[PDB]
Amino acid sequence: SNATNSFVMPKLSLTQKNPVFRLLILGRTGSSFYQSIPKEYQSLFELPKYHDSATFPQYTGIVIIFQELREMVSLLNRIVQYSQGKPVIPICQPGQVIQVKNVLKSFLRNKLVKLLFPPVVVTNKRDLKKMFQRLQDLSLEYGED
C-alpha cells in the first residue's frame, strides 16, 4: 500500500475528526506488549520513539506495563516530569499492591496521574482479551478515536 505520507482523511463535514486518543503503552519489560496486543485493538495504541522520556508528552496517555515496583517508579516519574497528570494506565502485578499502588498514591493522590482504564495483571495474558474490550468501549463512551 502506498501513500503520500500526509494524506487527507476527513470526517465531520471537513477534515475535523474527533480528538484522537493515543495511548502509548509501554513498559520496560513489556515493550513487546504492543506486539502481542490483538490487531483489533493494536491500532489504537502505539510504541515509543522518544524512549522512556520525551514520548510521554506526545501522547494522550501512556501506559506503564511493569511487573515490579521500581519498574513502575522510573516511568511513573517520567509521566509527571514530561507531562504531569496524564491519563496513564498501570498494568500491574498482585500482592505488590501494598507498595505498588501506594508509591503511586503520591502521584495519584496528588493528581499527578489519573486513569480511565481498569488495571490488569501483566502476567495474565488471559485478561487482556477482556481488558482491551473495555478500553475500546470506554473510549467509545467518551466519543474519542
Side-chain angles (χ1 to χ4, degrees):
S1 310
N2 299 32
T4 47
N5 296 330
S6 306
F7 186 75
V8 177
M9 184 60 203
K11 63 168 183 172
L12 300 174
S13 186
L14 299 177
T15 312
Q16 179 59 90
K17 187 194 177 317
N18 304 34
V20 48
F21 73 93
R22 248 307 198 230
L23 290 161
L24 203 191
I25 91 291
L26 68 79
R28 254 304 104 233
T29 46
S31 189
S32 309
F33 179 78
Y34 179 75
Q35 296 299 268
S36 59
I37 297 182
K39 68 295 178 187
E40 306 155 45
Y41 316 97
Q42 196 182 32
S43 299
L44 292 62
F45 318 112
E46 179 78 62
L47 276 179
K49 50 283 296 176
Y50 277 90
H51 286 92
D52 294 54
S53 50
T55 190
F56 293 40
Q58 299 199 90
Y59 291 73
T60 305
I62 35 287
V63 324
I64 309 178
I65 156 179
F66 66 101
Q67 318 182 269
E68 53 166 53
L69 289 58
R70 62 267 165 156
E71 179 184 16
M72 174 186 59
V73 305
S74 307
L75 285 49
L76 191 57
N77 258 272
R78 243 61 168 137
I79 295 176
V80 313
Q81 46 191 269
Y82 297 67
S83 291
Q84 192 289 92
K86 281 289 189 63
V88 299
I89 305 325
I91 307 298
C92 61
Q93 187 159 270
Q96 294 172 209
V97 305
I98 305 174
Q99 45 271 272
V100 144
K101 294 184 180 302
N102 270 337
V103 297
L104 166 150
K105 283 300 194 315
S106 300
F107 302 92
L108 193 291
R109 176 273 185 185
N110 291 328
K111 293 70 63 181
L112 300 177
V113 297
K114 280 132 286 183
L115 54 83
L116 49 74
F117 169 119
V120 52
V121 179
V122 51
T123 182
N124 190 30
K125 191 75 187 174
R126 307 171 189 107
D127 269 329
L128 309 195
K129 259 279 63 183
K130 65 83 185 299
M131 171 267 284
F132 286 130
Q133 298 183 32
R134 281 299 308 174
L135 188 166
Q136 185 200 215
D137 310 334
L138 167 125
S139 291
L140 304 181
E141 309 174 323
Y142 294 178
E144 49 181 47
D145 55 272

